[PDB]
Amino acid sequence: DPFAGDPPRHPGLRVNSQKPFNAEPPAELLAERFLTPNELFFTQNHLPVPAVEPSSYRLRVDGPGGGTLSLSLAELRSRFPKHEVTATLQCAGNRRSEMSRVRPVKGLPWDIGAISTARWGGARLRDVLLHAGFPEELQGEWHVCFEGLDADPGGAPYGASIPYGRALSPAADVLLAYEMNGTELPRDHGFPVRVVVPGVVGARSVKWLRRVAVSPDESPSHWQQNDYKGFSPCVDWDTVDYRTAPAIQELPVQSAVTQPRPGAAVPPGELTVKGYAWSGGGREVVRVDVSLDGGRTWKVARLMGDKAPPGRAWAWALWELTVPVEAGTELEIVCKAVDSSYNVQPDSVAPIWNLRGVLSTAWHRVRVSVQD
Amino acid sequence: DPFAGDPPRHPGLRVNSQKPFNAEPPAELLAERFLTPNELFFTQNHLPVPAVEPSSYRLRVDGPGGGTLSLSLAELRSRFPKHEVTATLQCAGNRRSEMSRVRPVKGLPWDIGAISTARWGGARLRDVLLHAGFPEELQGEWHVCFEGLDADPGGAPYGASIPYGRALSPAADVLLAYEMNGTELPRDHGFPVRVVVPGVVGARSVKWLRRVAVSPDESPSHWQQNDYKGFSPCVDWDTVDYRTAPAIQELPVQSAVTQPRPGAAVPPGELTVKGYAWSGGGREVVRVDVSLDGGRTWKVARLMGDKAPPGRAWAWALWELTVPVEAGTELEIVCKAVDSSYNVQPDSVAPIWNLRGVLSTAWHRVRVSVQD
Ligand SMILES: Nc1nc2c(c(=O)[nH]1)N[C@H]1C(S)=C(S)[C@@H](COP(=O)(O)O)O[C@H]1N2
Ligand SMILES: Nc1nc2c(c(=O)[nH]1)N[C@H]1C(S)=C(S)[C@@H](COP(=O)(O)O)O[C@H]1N2
Ligand SMILES: [Cl-]
Ligand SMILES: [Cl-]
Ligand SMILES: [Mo]
Ligand SMILES: [Mo]
């Protein structure tokens, strides 16, 4: 059994796949803290988790001339000044289950928790590429490809890429992280090294990093070429052409209600509605609107989190609204967020449906009742 | 009469205000060419158009030390290498009239044409600021403020600002343009010099430029402080607080059908539906979905325009779809676009309504009939 070596996990996780392991924190905890504890941080693994011996570990990074720099874990910690970045990882498949309610899709049935936040610490990718000899700017469209230590039966490793410009930008904060929420990277989250690409879909943050290579083309791996792309709602498995859409990089504006939960009965009087909101590309969320009546009237919720500099809002904003509720009434609780370029979330799922169930950002609707 | 000196305009424009002059090209022409002819390019003036004598004209630019560089038109053309940028200007109030159909708003009643595209030529703002002595990077949050030659009765000039980082970035392409579609700037469009801020709302492209100043704060002008901001649909004229929302800079994904027009009767057989689509922040539009039945089924339209580099899609994409139509049927034609960070347009206007009628990006719906 190729999965016998996997780490043990926290017992309260909402597991949707045991092998390979994929799970999300329970929604009643998801937004309980700004930083998600390492043991509740959602996990997405495509393969068995690699067992890595710290000192024999080497990160291979290909130089501009065809040579190969070979860094050990200790050298990565001491050569480069440690940088810390608090960033939210949201999986492309977050909220896929709401899509399945319209028309079945292919994929892990995530609810609203394929997203978590953490303070990451490690080397700036930028610094590692400069040390390897690359210039700050290459002419044309270049990419930085990553490969993990985890590989399938037939030898292919999980892989992804980001544009060279993003890798080199001081502002973009791309890290080769070896620390998570102040402790070392847990095995499930990439020990000893992973890439963390703030503002960008989870798929690009390659875990258990074994190689970094600069290339004129995107990563040729299956997960970069033939997956994680958005299509028209009309497209199906026989008409789908992966060359007609760009690989998902930055994600659109997103939000969900974490309290209360669907079906709940809530005491009359006052109700505190809580949730998260986030946007890709470092775009700050500037407002969250909340509705108790299915989206015909709205009030502005209160935002917490900490103002990050412009174009660098890598972390979610948690929100709450305490509102008056009348005994024996029916509520349809809805939330929607607005980002700094004023992008908004769409009303319904059907018009954004796609065969892979990714990019599910329609309003989150929660139905509950007020106790008599 | 303070407006006696205004330029004459093309006779076929859809004028919504004569003084000050505000007009849009007729929708049947809007998307007829990729570059909008200077005489049809939409015009938004807040005040009378300034009469400027070329040789006595001086652009005042404040240096880092409190000094003042003073450039003439000839020096602006010869000191700095001319750069050309094709960029679409969309006004914050575009499609405001669709908002008014839900609940009256305050503002010029634009239809779908408060948007146009042109090839601009002039000095890079960047180069002008470096010549003035500024560094490529200032610590903290800085702004570059602009003031036009046009001023109200009580002396205040039209003004706006953009973040310093945007002004200095080579990639961002901010220009002090003196040419438009190969000829000199027409008076209505800012002769002799205007700022052109690609990917950003029209309001920031200050026309008839008289001053450029770097400041730790945003432009203090009315149009930067107490206008051009987005609010919750619940907010009204007595609860509105302009300090709770950011000045609009980058705009969200947008699209509209230009052919056919509402109410048209179209021959049976085949129908070519045409329109535009655009997104702010240099984000390319990657798809346009078109529906003939009110948005329940969709087909992918065909895109034209020319692939710009990543993060620099400053120009709209024109689109068309030739579709089969049955005699004696009713059609509700709808279009929606998707940008490179996968942002999408919302289904309905009501949930994005705001008191100023700005940021109108819900699906454009056109109802027509097929002739028997
Ligand atoms: N090596 C490797 N990295 C990977 C993956 C993987 O299967 N293998 N999954 C990816 C995807 S789809 C996601 S959403 C994130 C999730 O990271 P997390 O498990 O630490 O939350 O890891 C990315 N990095
Ligand atoms: N000096 C000056 N610049 C200005 C304006 C103005 O009133 N005065 N209007 C602004 C706004 S709201 C818009 S939408 C654009 C429109 O530019 P255009 O008239 O060339 O299309 O100009 C901007 N620049
Ligand atoms: Cl997934
Ligand atoms: Cl307006
Ligand atoms: Mo993912
Ligand atoms: Mo405007």
JSON list of C-alpha atoms in Angstrom, two decimals, chain A residues 24 98 100 124 130 203 214 272 292 322 344 367 370:
[
{"chain": "A", "resi": 24, "resn": "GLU", "atom": "CA", "xyz": [-11.14, 20.60, 5.04]},
{"chain": "A", "resi": 98, "resn": "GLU", "atom": "CA", "xyz": [-22.56, 23.96, -4.93]},
{"chain": "A", "resi": 100, "resn": "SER", "atom": "CA", "xyz": [-22.74, 19.74, -8.42]},
{"chain": "A", "resi": 124, "resn": "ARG", "atom": "CA", "xyz": [12.26, 34.63, -1.22]},
{"chain": "A", "resi": 130, "resn": "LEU", "atom": "CA", "xyz": [19.36, 35.76, -8.23]},
{"chain": "A", "resi": 203, "resn": "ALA", "atom": "CA", "xyz": [-2.36, 24.36, -7.33]},
{"chain": "A", "resi": 214, "resn": "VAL", "atom": "CA", "xyz": [13.32, 28.60, -15.61]},
{"chain": "A", "resi": 272, "resn": "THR", "atom": "CA", "xyz": [-24.24, 37.12, 14.67]},
{"chain": "A", "resi": 292, "resn": "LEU", "atom": "CA", "xyz": [-31.18, 37.87, 5.40]},
{"chain": "A", "resi": 322, "resn": "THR", "atom": "CA", "xyz": [-24.95, 41.07, 14.36]},
{"chain": "A", "resi": 344, "resn": "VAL", "atom": "CA", "xyz": [-18.01, 41.43, -7.62]},
{"chain": "A", "resi": 367, "resn": "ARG", "atom": "CA", "xyz": [-31.14, 28.77, 4.93]},
{"chain": "A", "resi": 370, "resn": "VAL", "atom": "CA", "xyz": [-35.65, 31.28, 13.96]}
]
